[PDB]
Amino acid sequence: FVPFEGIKNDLKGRLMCYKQDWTGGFKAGFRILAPTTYIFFASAIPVISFGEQLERSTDGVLTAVQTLASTAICGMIHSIIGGQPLLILGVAEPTVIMYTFMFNFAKARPELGRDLFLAWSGWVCVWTALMLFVLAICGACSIINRFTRVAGELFGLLIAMLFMQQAIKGLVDEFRIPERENQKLKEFLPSWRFANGMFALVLSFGLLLTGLRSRKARSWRYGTGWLRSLIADYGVPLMVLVWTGVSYIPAGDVPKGIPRRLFSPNPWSPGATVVKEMLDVPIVYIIGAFIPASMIAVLYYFDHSVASQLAQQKEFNLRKPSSYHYDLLLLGFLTLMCGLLGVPPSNGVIPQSPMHTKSLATLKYPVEVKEQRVSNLLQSTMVGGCVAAMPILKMIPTSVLWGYFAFMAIESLPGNQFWERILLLFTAPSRRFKVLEDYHATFVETVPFKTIAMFTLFQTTYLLICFGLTWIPIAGVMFPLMIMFLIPVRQYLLPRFFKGAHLQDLDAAEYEEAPALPFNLAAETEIGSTTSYPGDLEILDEVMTRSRGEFRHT
Amino acid sequence: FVPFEGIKNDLKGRLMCYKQDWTGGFKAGFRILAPTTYIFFASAIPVISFGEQLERSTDGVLTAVQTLASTAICGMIHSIIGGQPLLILGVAEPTVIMYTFMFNFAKARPELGRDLFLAWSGWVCVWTALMLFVLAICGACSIINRFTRVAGELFGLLIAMLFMQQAIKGLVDEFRIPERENQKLKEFLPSWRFANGMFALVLSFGLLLTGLRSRKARSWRYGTGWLRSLIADYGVPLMVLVWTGVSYIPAGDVPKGIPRRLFSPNPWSPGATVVKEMLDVPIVYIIGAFIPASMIAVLYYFDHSVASQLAQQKEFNLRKPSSYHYDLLLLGFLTLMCGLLGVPPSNGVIPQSPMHTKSLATLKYPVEVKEQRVSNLLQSTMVGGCVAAMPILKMIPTSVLWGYFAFMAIESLPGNQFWERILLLFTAPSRRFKVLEDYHATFVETVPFKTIAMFTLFQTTYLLICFGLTWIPIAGVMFPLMIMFLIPVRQYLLPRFFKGAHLQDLDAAEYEEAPALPFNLAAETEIGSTTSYPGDLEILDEVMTRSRGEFRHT
């Protein structure tokens, strides 16, 4: 923990491969565009959704323009002078939540008001930048190995709950009159409002289901290989386009605002730095900005490091070193810059960074990764240029973005062991052999069910407490502290209540999986020892055709 | 083919087990109610849907009241005096189509008009009854073994296409003003009409998807066994109830007719036999009724026999004889009675009869079937009593019935080999090993792909020709002739173009299935000999988690 040692080591390591980082990207030629486009589409749409969320939550002060600008600028700067170019930067949901809390606080205090919200946010960002500078200089990133699975999975599930909550919020509001819209317009009559709500439901559910189906296109037996890969890679943008086109079908027989589209304004229109107002903020609020700044700093310290770790998995066989400390220092600088510019800060995002690394990976028949700084720069520049295309983006209905919120919420589940343990907890005792009949985690076999249930119950109680805390108007800005507390809890308290190898299996740094077992071997296990024989109708369901009731002979 | 021999033999066989048929049903006690309720729900809902279809297609002359009455009366009479009580009778889609054609013909001729449509239908039914009497007496049912798989599967797919067409028709019409409704009502304004259409889409798709998911409840690892069985058995009615309740949520904030509900009237209201009008029909049209009567007779001769055969599969180990000839004679009598009463005739339906037989089956650990006349009588009586509950049924939105049409259309596919062969035809050559990786038909392995493709192409051309014929205003009443022609075609022409065992495998009276093969054994086959290796992204998709991009270790 010697000051500046980590930064110096990271700079020394990354300075011997800079020219190579650029030349290798240039040597790839036009073939570097496919990963670039894939990651650009993976990054832009969630940023636009977060921008719309902020527009609804900040009374129009912050919109998709600011989120896109922050993402683009931070990504380009990180690509040019950052340590780990594989890391993808963008505006994340926790930042949106914290800024919503800050806006709610500012609006209720006349001394600040809506006019000084951005200035107070800039002071908050200054404090956060100082905190990140201190953390990077003191080598606090040397203990990221303690960011274990429990905290990461709990945070992921919490963000999934927030995503689904926002989706429900938006769909409900689609049935209502917007707060800052002319109430006398024809589109806001009860009949047209009801029609807009139902159309929003249709579009959102179509987007969600079609994207979920498209995610597994490469396993299909239909079409060409290139078409299957294209669908599996770009189903989200493709489905967004398809459902926008669907939304435009009745355009001629309905008012202008049916269905509702993005509220974010076009910056090109004449109607449309905050350091000048930062001076007008009272000193008391400048000092008090330390409070949310610490929470934002904790959030960034966790998320940046976790995303970089995931992007730098040993299975990728990366030949270049890591830059955790210098990356955190640069994140502090970027947060300061974004706070001064009046845009929300950006940080490492998941699963965008590992997806980028995967897109840059090939198998030599054994993983080889094309690591360079060109793809990140190009995708950030495209995200920035999307601002110039705001008129085109404004054609997207908001219901599609709410459906995308639900899509991310559901897509956070698959690889999450906490979710799987919850499902096992709510699984019937007599049907756990079904769990053993497919791919399953190793702790299912190597740990008793009672210990798993107890661990899952503790984790679920913690998660629900944090989610409820998020609902408190002011104290809800403190949930990063609860997330951080899981480190010392796991390190000290859990070993008292849990026996070693059990914690190691339930809190393993590696995702361990086991193959499906035969029915005979699934009953000798303790967990599957209570198997129950199938009923007559259950048996007949499988041996008879549903179309005509024909007996199947095998 | 000696006249009356089949009828006498069937009566002799069924007269030695009549008292037993009744006593065994009584001895079952209250445990006979579960199959009765299951089959009653399987029968009533499609009948109501067909009634609504007729109401829209017959300008309100025929409704769900008539269909329910016909189903109930025919079922009770068949149960009491029929030969095979396992056979379930009801109004089917082909009858609806033929009656729609007849109504369209009658409306355009002033000599008949809408006032004599039911009388002309009664004369048609008289002709059909005479035709069925002749067929039963001449022993035409002795050649039902020639009703091979090709014709049955083609007919099933044709009915599925008609179901989906009706579903699309109803959903489109939900956006429009009904022909016979007051156009000045508030619910028929463009805004409320658009809202009704979107609400209909939501309800229909929800019903369809939820029912499809519920059909496989018994394989779940959640809930109790009884709850899983209840869902798997009654998902359709349960989902209908759930989505009706959903439809009633905004009742207080929308006009009366939002969403639209069943148009069929309540017979209890004061506003509400046709032999008197049968005399007023011109002799020329009485003679000309012979034309549609022959087609209806062909349809019934096919469907009754096929349904009875499916309900009397040898795997059920039924200990009582068959009554094909007497059943056809009784069907003729029932058709005459229904024509006189002014209701559409009922006939054997699929898969209701095999589902009933399955519901009456238990395994003795080996199938034993409780064959009796009580379940059919009770379910028919309940279908009849549903008429008295018309006010309750009128609460069902029509969008739910259109969704049910789509549900039946999709549920006709699973066990259909013609559909599977179509899918294989449109399958990519390099991805047939995927077909071989799961349960598959035996002809996939035992027949070359070229022969399968040629057979499927011929069958598809025939099916499309019949479907297009259904669209011709008058000549479309002739599609049963095309269905019948498949018997001599299969018997004489196909052997010229196909080599024996190939036809036997592709047109087998038994549903032969083969288990999944290992990848190594899936490539040595001719069909799977063009396997292509997976790509890098395809490989990485399976070994990396979607939530966080974590490498899976197995």
PDB file of C-alpha atoms in Angstrom, chain A residues 219-379:
ATOM      1  CA  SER A 219     -28.480 -22.618 -32.142  1.00  0.00           C
ATOM      2  CA  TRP A 220     -31.241 -22.613 -34.770  1.00  0.00           C
ATOM      3  CA  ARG A 221     -31.422 -25.065 -37.665  1.00  0.00           C
ATOM      4  CA  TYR A 222     -32.920 -22.440 -40.005  1.00  0.00           C
ATOM      5  CA  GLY A 223     -31.415 -19.868 -42.335  1.00  0.00           C
ATOM      6  CA  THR A 224     -27.758 -19.296 -43.066  1.00  0.00           C
ATOM      7  CA  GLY A 225     -24.920 -19.161 -40.568  1.00  0.00           C
ATOM      8  CA  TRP A 226     -24.257 -15.493 -41.272  1.00  0.00           C
ATOM      9  CA  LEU A 227     -27.936 -14.633 -40.802  1.00  0.00           C
ATOM     10  CA  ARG A 228     -28.078 -16.582 -37.535  1.00  0.00           C
ATOM     11  CA  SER A 229     -24.982 -14.782 -36.247  1.00  0.00           C
ATOM     12  CA  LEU A 230     -26.358 -11.406 -37.344  1.00  0.00           C
ATOM     13  CA  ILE A 231     -29.618 -12.041 -35.495  1.00  0.00           C
ATOM     14  CA  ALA A 232     -27.847 -13.294 -32.373  1.00  0.00           C
ATOM     15  CA  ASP A 233     -25.620 -10.198 -32.398  1.00  0.00           C
ATOM     16  CA  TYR A 234     -28.067  -7.422 -33.367  1.00  0.00           C
ATOM     17  CA  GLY A 235     -31.515  -8.673 -32.361  1.00  0.00           C
ATOM     18  CA  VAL A 236     -31.969  -5.806 -29.907  1.00  0.00           C
ATOM     19  CA  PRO A 237     -31.409  -3.008 -32.474  1.00  0.00           C
ATOM     20  CA  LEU A 238     -33.145  -5.053 -35.175  1.00  0.00           C
ATOM     21  CA  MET A 239     -36.205  -5.616 -32.990  1.00  0.00           C
ATOM     22  CA  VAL A 240     -36.186  -1.937 -31.997  1.00  0.00           C
ATOM     23  CA  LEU A 241     -36.293  -0.990 -35.680  1.00  0.00           C
ATOM     24  CA  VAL A 242     -38.981  -3.579 -36.463  1.00  0.00           C
ATOM     25  CA  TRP A 243     -41.262  -2.437 -33.653  1.00  0.00           C
ATOM     26  CA  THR A 244     -40.724   1.236 -34.495  1.00  0.00           C
ATOM     27  CA  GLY A 245     -41.882   0.394 -38.010  1.00  0.00           C
ATOM     28  CA  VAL A 246     -44.863  -1.429 -36.520  1.00  0.00           C
ATOM     29  CA  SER A 247     -45.609   1.660 -34.423  1.00  0.00           C
ATOM     30  CA  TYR A 248     -45.631   3.764 -37.599  1.00  0.00           C
ATOM     31  CA  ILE A 249     -48.269   1.609 -39.346  1.00  0.00           C
ATOM     32  CA  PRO A 250     -51.380   3.459 -38.038  1.00  0.00           C
ATOM     33  CA  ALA A 251     -49.680   6.855 -38.263  1.00  0.00           C
ATOM     34  CA  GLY A 252     -52.226   8.169 -40.768  1.00  0.00           C
ATOM     35  CA  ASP A 253     -55.327   7.290 -38.728  1.00  0.00           C
ATOM     36  CA  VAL A 254     -54.152   8.533 -35.304  1.00  0.00           C
ATOM     37  CA  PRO A 255     -53.015  11.851 -33.815  1.00  0.00           C
ATOM     38  CA  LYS A 256     -49.401  12.968 -33.867  1.00  0.00           C
ATOM     39  CA  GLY A 257     -48.508  11.685 -30.405  1.00  0.00           C
ATOM     40  CA  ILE A 258     -49.929   8.171 -30.772  1.00  0.00           C
ATOM     41  CA  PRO A 259     -47.811   6.270 -29.756  1.00  0.00           C
ATOM     42  CA  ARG A 260     -45.656   8.516 -27.556  1.00  0.00           C
ATOM     43  CA  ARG A 261     -42.044   8.902 -28.692  1.00  0.00           C
ATOM     44  CA  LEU A 262     -38.835  10.103 -27.070  1.00  0.00           C
ATOM     45  CA  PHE A 263     -39.243  13.321 -25.093  1.00  0.00           C
ATOM     46  CA  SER A 264     -35.539  14.189 -25.264  1.00  0.00           C
ATOM     47  CA  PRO A 265     -35.117  17.395 -27.313  1.00  0.00           C
ATOM     48  CA  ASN A 266     -33.106  17.882 -30.483  1.00  0.00           C
ATOM     49  CA  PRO A 267     -30.021  19.998 -29.638  1.00  0.00           C
ATOM     50  CA  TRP A 268     -29.840  21.325 -33.211  1.00  0.00           C
ATOM     51  CA  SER A 269     -32.982  23.374 -32.584  1.00  0.00           C
ATOM     52  CA  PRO A 270     -32.287  26.927 -31.341  1.00  0.00           C
ATOM     53  CA  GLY A 271     -34.347  26.329 -28.194  1.00  0.00           C
ATOM     54  CA  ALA A 272     -31.872  23.765 -26.846  1.00  0.00           C
ATOM     55  CA  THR A 273     -20.178  24.356 -18.618  1.00  0.00           C
ATOM     56  CA  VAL A 274     -21.668  25.276 -15.227  1.00  0.00           C
ATOM     57  CA  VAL A 275     -18.657  26.652 -13.318  1.00  0.00           C
ATOM     58  CA  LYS A 276     -20.346  30.064 -13.178  1.00  0.00           C
ATOM     59  CA  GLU A 277     -23.255  28.679 -11.143  1.00  0.00           C
ATOM     60  CA  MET A 278     -20.979  26.490  -9.002  1.00  0.00           C
ATOM     61  CA  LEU A 279     -19.867  29.695  -7.270  1.00  0.00           C
ATOM     62  CA  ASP A 280     -23.457  30.729  -6.469  1.00  0.00           C
ATOM     63  CA  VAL A 281     -24.086  27.539  -4.465  1.00  0.00           C
ATOM     64  CA  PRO A 282     -24.042  28.142  -0.683  1.00  0.00           C
ATOM     65  CA  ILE A 283     -20.923  26.912   1.093  1.00  0.00           C
ATOM     66  CA  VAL A 284     -23.079  24.696   3.317  1.00  0.00           C
ATOM     67  CA  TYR A 285     -24.375  22.700   0.349  1.00  0.00           C
ATOM     68  CA  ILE A 286     -20.883  22.578  -1.155  1.00  0.00           C
ATOM     69  CA  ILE A 287     -19.698  20.922   2.058  1.00  0.00           C
ATOM     70  CA  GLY A 288     -22.764  18.680   2.197  1.00  0.00           C
ATOM     71  CA  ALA A 289     -22.091  17.390  -1.308  1.00  0.00           C
ATOM     72  CA  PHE A 290     -19.469  15.204   0.398  1.00  0.00           C
ATOM     73  CA  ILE A 291     -22.265  12.815   1.431  1.00  0.00           C
ATOM     74  CA  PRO A 292     -23.560  11.602  -1.970  1.00  0.00           C
ATOM     75  CA  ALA A 293     -20.037  11.941  -3.366  1.00  0.00           C
ATOM     76  CA  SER A 294     -18.747   9.218  -1.038  1.00  0.00           C
ATOM     77  CA  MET A 295     -21.520   6.841  -2.118  1.00  0.00           C
ATOM     78  CA  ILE A 296     -20.880   7.543  -5.805  1.00  0.00           C
ATOM     79  CA  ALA A 297     -17.159   6.985  -5.228  1.00  0.00           C
ATOM     80  CA  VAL A 298     -17.862   3.634  -3.559  1.00  0.00           C
ATOM     81  CA  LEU A 299     -20.113   2.645  -6.460  1.00  0.00           C
ATOM     82  CA  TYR A 300     -17.464   3.543  -9.034  1.00  0.00           C
ATOM     83  CA  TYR A 301     -14.634   1.904  -7.080  1.00  0.00           C
ATOM     84  CA  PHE A 302     -16.665  -1.313  -7.064  1.00  0.00           C
ATOM     85  CA  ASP A 303     -18.024  -1.263 -10.616  1.00  0.00           C
ATOM     86  CA  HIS A 304     -14.915  -0.102 -12.492  1.00  0.00           C
ATOM     87  CA  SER A 305     -12.789  -2.763 -10.810  1.00  0.00           C
ATOM     88  CA  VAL A 306     -15.331  -5.557 -11.283  1.00  0.00           C
ATOM     89  CA  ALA A 307     -15.832  -4.718 -14.964  1.00  0.00           C
ATOM     90  CA  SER A 308     -12.080  -4.571 -15.583  1.00  0.00           C
ATOM     91  CA  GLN A 309     -11.621  -7.906 -13.798  1.00  0.00           C
ATOM     92  CA  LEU A 310     -14.326  -9.517 -15.930  1.00  0.00           C
ATOM     93  CA  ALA A 311     -12.793  -8.062 -19.097  1.00  0.00           C
ATOM     94  CA  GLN A 312      -9.380  -9.391 -17.970  1.00  0.00           C
ATOM     95  CA  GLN A 313     -10.322 -12.995 -17.197  1.00  0.00           C
ATOM     96  CA  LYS A 314      -7.406 -15.428 -17.281  1.00  0.00           C
ATOM     97  CA  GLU A 315      -9.241 -17.606 -19.818  1.00  0.00           C
ATOM     98  CA  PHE A 316      -8.706 -14.859 -22.418  1.00  0.00           C
ATOM     99  CA  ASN A 317      -4.919 -15.440 -22.276  1.00  0.00           C
ATOM    100  CA  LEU A 318      -4.179 -11.716 -22.325  1.00  0.00           C
ATOM    101  CA  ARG A 319      -0.481 -10.938 -22.763  1.00  0.00           C
ATOM    102  CA  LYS A 320      -0.606  -7.364 -21.410  1.00  0.00           C
ATOM    103  CA  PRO A 321      -0.693  -6.153 -17.783  1.00  0.00           C
ATOM    104  CA  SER A 322      -3.422  -4.480 -15.728  1.00  0.00           C
ATOM    105  CA  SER A 323      -3.923  -0.806 -14.864  1.00  0.00           C
ATOM    106  CA  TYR A 324      -6.434  -0.767 -12.000  1.00  0.00           C
ATOM    107  CA  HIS A 325      -4.927   2.136 -10.040  1.00  0.00           C
ATOM    108  CA  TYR A 326      -4.275   4.387 -13.033  1.00  0.00           C
ATOM    109  CA  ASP A 327      -7.723   3.520 -14.386  1.00  0.00           C
ATOM    110  CA  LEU A 328      -9.311   4.669 -11.122  1.00  0.00           C
ATOM    111  CA  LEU A 329      -7.278   7.892 -11.200  1.00  0.00           C
ATOM    112  CA  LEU A 330      -8.392   8.563 -14.776  1.00  0.00           C
ATOM    113  CA  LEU A 331     -11.977   7.812 -13.736  1.00  0.00           C
ATOM    114  CA  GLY A 332     -11.659  10.475 -11.053  1.00  0.00           C
ATOM    115  CA  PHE A 333     -10.395  12.968 -13.622  1.00  0.00           C
ATOM    116  CA  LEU A 334     -13.224  12.054 -16.010  1.00  0.00           C
ATOM    117  CA  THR A 335     -15.788  12.450 -13.226  1.00  0.00           C
ATOM    118  CA  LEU A 336     -14.424  15.921 -12.492  1.00  0.00           C
ATOM    119  CA  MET A 337     -14.607  16.849 -16.179  1.00  0.00           C
ATOM    120  CA  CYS A 338     -18.165  15.539 -16.564  1.00  0.00           C
ATOM    121  CA  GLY A 339     -19.298  17.344 -13.423  1.00  0.00           C
ATOM    122  CA  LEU A 340     -17.860  20.585 -14.769  1.00  0.00           C
ATOM    123  CA  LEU A 341     -19.524  20.023 -18.160  1.00  0.00           C
ATOM    124  CA  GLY A 342     -22.940  19.366 -16.607  1.00  0.00           C
ATOM    125  CA  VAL A 343     -23.363  15.731 -17.688  1.00  0.00           C
ATOM    126  CA  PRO A 344     -23.623  12.574 -15.550  1.00  0.00           C
ATOM    127  CA  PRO A 345     -20.326  10.712 -15.110  1.00  0.00           C
ATOM    128  CA  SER A 346     -19.591   7.431 -16.857  1.00  0.00           C
ATOM    129  CA  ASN A 347     -17.919   4.311 -15.492  1.00  0.00           C
ATOM    130  CA  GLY A 348     -17.162   0.708 -16.370  1.00  0.00           C
ATOM    131  CA  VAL A 349     -20.277  -1.200 -17.416  1.00  0.00           C
ATOM    132  CA  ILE A 350     -21.240  -4.881 -17.404  1.00  0.00           C
ATOM    133  CA  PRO A 351     -21.520  -7.067 -19.483  1.00  0.00           C
ATOM    134  CA  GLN A 352     -20.367  -4.634 -22.182  1.00  0.00           C
ATOM    135  CA  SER A 353     -16.652  -4.957 -21.380  1.00  0.00           C
ATOM    136  CA  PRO A 354     -16.516  -8.796 -21.354  1.00  0.00           C
ATOM    137  CA  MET A 355     -18.702  -8.789 -24.468  1.00  0.00           C
ATOM    138  CA  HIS A 356     -16.169  -6.505 -26.167  1.00  0.00           C
ATOM    139  CA  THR A 357     -13.296  -8.772 -25.144  1.00  0.00           C
ATOM    140  CA  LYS A 358     -15.215 -11.794 -26.456  1.00  0.00           C
ATOM    141  CA  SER A 359     -15.913  -9.984 -29.732  1.00  0.00           C
ATOM    142  CA  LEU A 360     -12.157  -9.395 -30.019  1.00  0.00           C
ATOM    143  CA  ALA A 361     -11.418 -13.096 -29.377  1.00  0.00           C
ATOM    144  CA  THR A 362     -10.713 -15.948 -31.794  1.00  0.00           C
ATOM    145  CA  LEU A 363      -9.921 -19.632 -31.277  1.00  0.00           C
ATOM    146  CA  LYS A 364      -6.766 -21.143 -32.802  1.00  0.00           C
ATOM    147  CA  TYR A 365      -7.475 -24.856 -33.234  1.00  0.00           C
ATOM    148  CA  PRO A 366      -6.941 -21.685 -27.302  1.00  0.00           C
ATOM    149  CA  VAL A 367      -8.297 -18.141 -27.028  1.00  0.00           C
ATOM    150  CA  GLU A 368      -6.420 -15.279 -28.701  1.00  0.00           C
ATOM    151  CA  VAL A 369      -7.625 -11.705 -28.159  1.00  0.00           C
ATOM    152  CA  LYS A 370      -6.952  -8.765 -30.482  1.00  0.00           C
ATOM    153  CA  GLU A 371      -6.291  -6.091 -27.852  1.00  0.00           C
ATOM    154  CA  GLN A 372      -6.039  -2.522 -29.145  1.00  0.00           C
ATOM    155  CA  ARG A 373      -7.441   0.989 -28.714  1.00  0.00           C
ATOM    156  CA  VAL A 374      -9.244   1.411 -32.056  1.00  0.00           C
ATOM    157  CA  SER A 375     -12.550  -0.376 -31.414  1.00  0.00           C
ATOM    158  CA  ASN A 376     -13.244   1.538 -28.195  1.00  0.00           C
ATOM    159  CA  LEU A 377     -12.406   4.881 -29.805  1.00  0.00           C
ATOM    160  CA  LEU A 378     -14.597   4.190 -32.836  1.00  0.00           C
ATOM    161  CA  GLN A 379     -17.568   2.987 -30.778  1.00  0.00           C
TER     162      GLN A 379
END
